[PDB]
Amino acid sequence: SNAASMGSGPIDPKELLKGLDSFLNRDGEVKSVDGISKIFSLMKEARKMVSRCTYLNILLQTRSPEILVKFIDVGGYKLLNNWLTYSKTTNNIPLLQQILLTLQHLPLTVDHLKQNNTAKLVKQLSKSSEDEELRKLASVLVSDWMAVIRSQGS
């Protein structure tokens, strides 16, 4: 879509999150494909932990696959991968686990796993996450991804 600067005074991060409702359906999931483009651009700047957790949920409740592929296209996958290793340093159980659920929720391919080492990062979590649910979730994601990586290699 077209873009322009449209500079203005600062906007509340509450108001930025509130502005995402405009992209949802009555049923609660993102219905506009370009809406996710803006959701992702704001996710880059989601400095607050609660804000990140909220963004993860918005993607998770978005069962619609057309939205999820576009989230990956804009590089949302790359951002989830960044959030994963970033949250590992703070050992934030709910953030970490919810990030992993978002990875499993979107359609994945071996290329994304190898290029950003994501599979190697979650491997550490499968053994080092203190919370039993988190290490369980991470272990499922590892085993699932190993099936994909072993299906196409060289």
* Sign, Cα dihedral of 95, 70, 42, 21: negative
Q: Which CATH architecture has domain 13-149?
A: Up-down Bundle (1.20)
The residue extents of the domains of the chain are: 13-149
Question: 60 CB contacts (<8 Å, ≥6 apart)?
Answer: 98, 101, 102, 105
Residue 13, classed as helix, strand or coil, is: helix
Q: How was this structure determined?
A: NMR
The DSSP code sequence of 53-98 is HHHHHHHHH---HHHHHHHHHTTHHHHHHHHHHHHHTTT-HHHHHH
